[PDB]
Symmetry: D2
Subunit: 341 residues, 4 copies
């Protein structure tokens, strides 16, 4: 077993661990540690109880061996003993002792090549930044598109954002088949934890406004990040995110100019075949009249609504839902199960 550590037990950190247990197939690695700036009792409480994902179907038992605090978790006929830490500064983590092979960096606070490496300076072999890269990176991966393009010499990988992981395959698939000249992306997204309950000072003057009562248009790391995966799309794609007051799940609305003839039928049939072949693992298509709440806890990177496809002359639009928490947390798992074979 490879040994994995999560730094930052937030919406992502925590759902990774849930996903470890909830998965239909046992992952061939173990999660052996978690860090956060909060205490264990809080961490365990938010792990157990989730406004978004429900009560956790299993048992968590805190034990104290030595000074080392450990969670004994059990669910889906599977066990894990995890060490709980409360270190603010990553360079001071015990990754060497615990022998951590990969660190899922899920704090938002350590996106640089410099901060990433601090975990390596603390004994870790590899790191995965769970976010768009800030600066330099050894690699920018979207599981199902370029996970095979990881070299073993790669220490600072990025798994990008959820948005990027829905977006990239749509573009890959279509550019490849019909040719995309340019494209523009509207993302309609559930409220995220960085927003404000009420009008409160914030870096973003948009995201300063009450989360629960506003439509809030804003920036998306997705575009800058998608261009580190496909540099050819520089100057050829742009877009933005809209925040609305639902708790979870998002939609991506992508408008593009095709270089060959295109029909609704042809566009939809392409995406279906990909869902059944190369992109089986991460993509699915639906012709059913669903809404956001229907895709909660869905492990796919994207579910395409084929009813929503529109073509006019050479311009086309497609639409796809993703569970921005669940989908992405399963892609972090799937990515670690790839490094070993």
């Amino acid at each position: 077993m490879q040994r994995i550590a999560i730094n930052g037990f937030g919406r992502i950190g925590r759902n990774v661990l849930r996903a470890w247990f909830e998965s239909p197939k046992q992952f061939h690695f173990e999660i052996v540690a978690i860090n956060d700036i909060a205490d264990v009792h809080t961490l365990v409480h938010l792990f157990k109880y989730d406004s978004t994902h429900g009560r956790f179907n299993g048992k968590v038992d805190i034990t104290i061996e030595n000074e080392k605090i450990y969670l004994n978790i059990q669910s889906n006929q599977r066990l894990l003993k995890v060490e709980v830490l409360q270190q603010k500064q990553p360079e001071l983590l015990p990754w060497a002792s615990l022998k951590i092979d990969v660190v899922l960096e899920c704090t938002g606070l350590f996106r640089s090549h410099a901060d990433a490496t601090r975990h390596l300076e603390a004994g870790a072999k590899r790191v995965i930044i769970g976010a768009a890269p800030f600066d330099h990176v050894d690699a920018a991966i979207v599981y199902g598109v370029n996970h095979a393009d990881v070299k073993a010499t790669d220490q600072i990988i990025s798994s990008v954002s959820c948005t990027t992981q829905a977006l990239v395959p749509l573009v890959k698939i279509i550019d490849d088949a019909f040719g995309i000249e340019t494209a523009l992306m509207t993302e309609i997204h559930a409220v995220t934890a960085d927003q404000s309950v009420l009008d409160h000072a914030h870096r973003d003057l948009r995201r300063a406004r009450a989360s629960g009562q506003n439509i809030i248009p804003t920036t998306s790391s997705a575009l800058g990040a998608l261009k580190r995966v496909m540099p050819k799309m520089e100057d050829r794609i742009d877009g933005y995110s809209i925040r609305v007051p639902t708790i979870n799940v998002a939609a991506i609305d992508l408008t593009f100019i095709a270089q060959s003839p295109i029909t609704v039928h042809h566009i939809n049939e392409l995406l279906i075949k990909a869902s059944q072949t190369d992109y089986a693992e991460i993509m699915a298509v639906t012709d059913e009249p669903l809404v956001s709440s229907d895709f909660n806890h869905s492990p796919y990177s994207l579910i395409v609504d084929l009813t929503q496809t529109m073509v006019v002359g050479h311009q086309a639009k497609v639409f796809a839902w993703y569970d921005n928490e669940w989908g992405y947390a399963n892609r972090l798992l799937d990515l670690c199960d790839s490094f070993k074979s």
Copy 2:
């Protein structure tokens, strides 16, 4: 005296009546009657207290002259005596005696020429259908664009949807300045009164879902309507509407292909100018990072977000807000004021 009546004291019908009193200028016509299938006290209560636009600044007192009911409404140094009625069957209404010059159909249930004529058989002389056209109509009017081409012979007239009232000005202005090859619309709309609170049976399986907790991509009457008003744009444009849980205000994401050189600046500059020159009583533009609730009670048909503008090659995206309720309600008064000229 121009005499107007409102059939359906709804979100629209009540906001029309308020708008009469709240306008800067006094309109050269009077509202003299309203009809709803609800009782008077319910109508008065809802008229006085609004979850969205606030309390009515004024007095409303019920008097029962003859065997008729009247409302005595004093506000903004103005007074009206409005007769209240309760007749589900539009032809049974006394439009003959009251000398109704124009009826505003705000029920939602009577949009066919056939159905709307029932007001003319009641003695009314003209009918503005406050909605998109079901079958045929003598005219289809977006105030500020084609309000002038209404005829004396015209009797059944449509003010279209609010979406349509914001989309047309944009398309007119851009097709005229740059050439639109094709375009596509995403409308992000607040909840509406036809939707459902929890999951409940409904003719549309999408709006059937819980309004408060869902993103609900649905359809827009706003495109069929725009093809009426601008027939030369047939087949150049399509779109769809998303419902999201805020109480009020909507936006449009318009994504078009341009037939000549375009830049973010030159787009934004054309819009600003157009607002200042030809389209001033219905169009504004803002430079600031605002959100939906900043447009509550805005009378404009559309406010353009200058920051939200984007160009990649020949493709471009512009973005406009509007108060779906209040915006539209001012265009109904604005339209009526154009007949007595």
Copy 3:
């Protein structure tokens, strides 16, 4: 084995049928028919997809025959053939042909003895009204309290409201143990299906207001119902309800005067003992810091929050959560199962 039918396939009716399959306990009766005013297609979609409780872990297949429409539902290793009907007039329903032993009236439209007998005319042997009695009932029942006092001759029963199911055991337990001079109830309830999305005509001028954006004080059926169940308490307990914009789950704030010595411990300890002994069936207690989301999909009639328990002098206050849909649906099955052996 007994044959059950559901008139009205909404929040309750649909959760009745699911709870039947999801129940870890198999029930000894079968549900063989349902009726609503919407088409099978709408009914299936809504059964399969739910904003509150999620997707159904099962398969639904429609069987259209010469005239009859059936549903073949398979879940949790159980199967059911359910005839689907569309009759707004309960007297005409084929309850004879189908041999319906019990009907559940989850429509909220047939609460009188008069109207509930319309089922008895159509061939049914017994009706349970899924609401508070309106005029006369052969019995008002709270499962876990007086479920044993159902005489086999009783043809028209009532299973009161979700709120009554919780209030009664709380009062029973406390009045028996300490003695209630008087009590006052505050219910804080998620939004219900009868409320309005936006401000719209309604019978109640409070429930006419936009559900999503408003605290809404309102009345409770539960007090009338409680007097029918525990008649000695006439005039000793009043109360009211408050709707807030959550999707599901209610709470109950009972404030009472005690006739003997009360302390926080002594109250909680008794409530614990009940949850363990007499009422381990339908009652649970937590010390943990939970919120509404945590009781979503809990089948208990009431979960007491012991930390919220408070005493000053002779007055005290206790707090209980319940899943207003799921608890109430489970108590209907629980009830139907009690008419056996």
Copy 4:
């Protein structure tokens, strides 16, 4: 001219400034400075644009004079020139230089006697803490009850909370007429700035949960505070609070044992009388069926719902609304204006 300064330009700070300009009666004193840890541009935007209360009706202009930042604000035919600051440490502020007669402390952090003194040792003459007292104070004041009891020796004063200012009149008005043996409070409150948007680590584990999706019981400084104001109520009152997913406006449900015969009529007449006579400035009473968003922007410390009063036995309950932002903000101004002569 008294000179006032605001520390913490939040929901209270901003609403305090706004309310200065909106008041019918000019205040015979002036706000001359604000301090927040945020950039002036953020503070100005957030002041101008408000999800809860609207656009500011007036013009704000920034000037940079002698390396000093100022705000020139014009509205309601009034002008204020206000210096903006950014000192996290209160001992460092220039209160002496500006000759500040009263600091308003709206940060939430500096509530201990020793903290609040940092403003005094920084040059200010008096300080009002805009929250319940943390440890001790020179005086805890509710405008309209004990406002005339302030001494010249009271330099650190508490203006308590939104909640306390509604509760103290109710408790006092009734205790005086009828006698209160004991009382228990339930407060239903809108979301506060300090809550979390999604489940996120937090000191309080109830307030850690998603604000827009939960009912969340919590604690209320209002009783500690009311005991400081009415020492005789020690051991005679208690309560707790509930956050629900609305943006603004709270209500208070108060249940008490009377020591004298009570009826509904007699309670409502006493409160109507008090609203008309001694509590006229802070209290009001409505007989209408209204909901939360109707009391938005109301300046009153409380508004009894005459319709909501209930009595059974010696025990009774009364219900009152208050705009938790706007109400309190006026009481700060009203209390500053009571320092004259």
